Amino acid sequence: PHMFELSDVIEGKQFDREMLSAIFDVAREMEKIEKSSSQSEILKGYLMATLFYEPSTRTRLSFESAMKRLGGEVLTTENAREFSSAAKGETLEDTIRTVEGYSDIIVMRHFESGAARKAAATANIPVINAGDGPGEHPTQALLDVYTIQSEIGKLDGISVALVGDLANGRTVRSLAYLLAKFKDVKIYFVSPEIVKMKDDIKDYLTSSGVEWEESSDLMEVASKCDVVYQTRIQRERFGERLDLYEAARGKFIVDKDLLGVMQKKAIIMHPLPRLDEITADVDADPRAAYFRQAKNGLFIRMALLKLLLVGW
Amino acid sequence: HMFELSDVIEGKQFDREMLSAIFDVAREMEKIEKSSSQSEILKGYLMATLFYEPSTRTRLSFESAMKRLGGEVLTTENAREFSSAAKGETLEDTIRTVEGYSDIIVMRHFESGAARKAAATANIPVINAGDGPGEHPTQALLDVYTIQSEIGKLDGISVALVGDLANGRTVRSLAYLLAKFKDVKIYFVSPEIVKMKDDIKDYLTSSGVEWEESSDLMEVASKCDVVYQTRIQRERFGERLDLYEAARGKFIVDKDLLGVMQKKAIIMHPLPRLDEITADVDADPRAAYFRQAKNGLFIRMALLKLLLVGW
Amino acid sequence: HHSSGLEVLFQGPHMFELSDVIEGKQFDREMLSAIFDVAREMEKIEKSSSQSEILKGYLMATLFYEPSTRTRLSFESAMKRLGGEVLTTENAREFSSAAKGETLEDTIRTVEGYSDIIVMRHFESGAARKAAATANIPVINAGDGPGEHPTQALLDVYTIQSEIGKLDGISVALVGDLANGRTVRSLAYLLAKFKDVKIYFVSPEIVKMKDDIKDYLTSSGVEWEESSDLMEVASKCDVVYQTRIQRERFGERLDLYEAARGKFIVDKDLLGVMQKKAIIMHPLPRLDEITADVDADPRAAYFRQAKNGLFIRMALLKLLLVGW
């Protein structure tokens, strides 16, 4: 019995290997609570205020479900830009000092990088970053690592393929950041050259002693990975280079043929939403883990709510 | 025992025995709502709403229903704007995502056919809250329940369906369920150009339901247990503004219409109304449309109860 | 047990009528004393670890036709802190069937079938009274478009009593757009129910307080003074109650705009001339009319004011639904 060492959940760098492992154990105890017939009272009497400045399905509803499955209540604000007094020019710091009067924990998806950290510094209650505009989405990174552990049974000694828009991809960057905390990890960067991973993550993995390789050949890489983590490449990333778009057409898709070359114990992940970059006929394969991944978000967010409000 | 329906999607799922049994559950839900004790029947269950179109009655009655039973609700309104359906996510993906967080899904989509796709996809129950311009089965249930409740029986009744019959999803759906009862008579009251389509006419004929068409709401209304009013949108007359003008003032529920009605008849309207029912009708005890909305709460309590914990 | 120093001689219900919360003139001294006493009991419930069940089994319906942060969330928090439930409707203009032309009376007679209390912020003055007259359940006015915001008036007076320790004998500066200031007019109205109150109207002449409120204060024997000099007035006030002046109010008179520039701002210079036991209030939201560096001063009471809104709204919910 003791206080959680984090006062807020804002950024990947707040987490070390031991913290990640301990949180993942709590997520397994939350999975047992969620499966139970009887209503948990762990967070009875606690109120969570949401502040969604951008749209969300998975993050907004998993946090609300997590709070209610633990017996807590929720005060929602979506389109804090239309329906909140943030539509009358109110600063973030004012919104936070107002809303903490009514609540015990704040969950915020802002439109501007740095918003979540300013919120945490201003508030005298815990803040969770639910996505920080072009910034960090740390509970996405936590549930992604948890899903790998849950599906593969290990984080040490794995090969992970990060596919799609790696240059501008916040989830692939954050997943690489956290995976670098385990041993004997290999990461494959699979992308068109035009959206390859930025030097900052490459140099970070090297300095962490994580082996990495760059490829434009998903079929080859997929055959020797434990995990294929898929993300969208937006057409607009090719700018006027429609020659380069044509060359990438059909080369970074998860389809039945790609599952054909993958190992029987490997998995397909996607933070979601997806468009055509994973074909609907892949969903029937037991190795398609993206819906299980979204459900693990419920257990990870239950664990963080429980830890921030009542401790270990 | 287990409810015989896995989902509530379309009126054709219902036989008259199932309707009568649901109405008995709705009366048990009315006693629960009236009690001063918080029900715990649905304690621990979570309902996710998905509203892709605006709603007052349907949205708030489902949420009230769940909470009056001690359940909780995860709401999504304008799933077009504030959901990740605002970034092109397919219905099947939304449903497989949302079912990870909830025990029952209530959905008002913008496209006919969405609710049955959601039911087929989900491993939890789905209730159709309005399938865009298609099935709105809980409206049809609360409509038939309101008639049973106000009139005291469904066999042997006389119902006027008034307004846009050609295009009227709600009046067509109410005709579909009333024809499961015996010795029913239906009056179709409308401008001739928006008369009831031939499919519903043949359906009533085959069902052994007597029907009559009329443009004379004063003569019909004197002979009916129920006047079920709906609005005729100007759009339905298209370029026929002459037929619009000829209908003006002729399909209104007002004090003069109530004056020719039997003392135990009722006015119903799915709502919202504009001027097709005058405000001064509201004070008449026969004005049943606010009681009808409240009956939605008891019907929706009954369906949530039945789908989640059974009879 | 009387906040006025004397012992409470009788235990039992009060003598007032309270079935809706619509307008300031409902709030006689007996009712203000009761609401403030219940608000102090709610501060203890809110502090406590155990979940209150005072309003278990009650359902609130909200109808917000205008944007809100403090009023919408404080009502919902208030209901849930007392173990009640909430059915929300924000954007009742876009996401409700009032997007399809429905009358307010039809909305109220619909929603009352699903709920035990309605909290409404409409866009038209007079909506809250029409909703109360229509409904057979309690209605609370959460802001009646350009009309009254009575729960703000309540929490403002309660905040003054809490921060200063009295209402009789205080000096209050009402600052900003007084001519069109819903909250300053309602605050002036409730303060006139107490003894030896002094009010300072601080503003540009162009947005000075209307004669109806001046005449009311004169009739009620409340001393008042007009000023365009916030630095002079702030030094002799218990309370500086700040509000925004919209540039739009100067019309074509940009000479008058220029002349008011930086004259009606609460900043560290103004705090400098203020008494140690004085306070800054603002109903919120603010923009530039209170500088961020004022927030660290312990006299900056506008976030404590907003919190007091929770305790007031908990008190009203209890008084309306379960009574004495």
Author numbering:
A (entry chain B): 79 to 390
B (entry chain A): 80 to 390
C (entry chain C): 67 to 390
List sentences from the manuscript:
However, much remains unknown in plants about the unique organization, regulation, and localization of the enzymes required for de novo biosynthesis of pyrimidines, which are potential targets for crop improvement and weed control. This metabolic pathway starts in the chloroplast, where aspartate transcarbamoylase (ATC) catalyzes the condensation of carbamoyl aspartate from aspartate (Asp) and carbamoyl phosphate (CP)1,3. In general, ATCs consist of a catalytic homotrimer with three active sites in between the subunits that can be allosterically regulated by association with other proteins. Each subunit folds into two subdomains of similar size: an N-domain (aa 82–221 and 374–390) occupying the center of the trimer and holding the binding site for CP, and a C-domain (aa 222–373) bearing the Asp binding site.
Two additional atATC structures reinforced this hypothesis. The second structure, obtained by co-crystallization with CP, showed all three subunits in the trimer bound to CP. In both structures, the three CP-loops in the trimer fold in an active conformation but show poor electron density compared to the rest of the protein. In fact, E160 and F161 were traced in only one subunit, and modeling in similar conformation in the other subunits caused steric clash and charge repulsion. This mechanism relies on the projection of F161 towards the three-fold axis, which prevents the CP-loops from reaching simultaneously the active conformation.
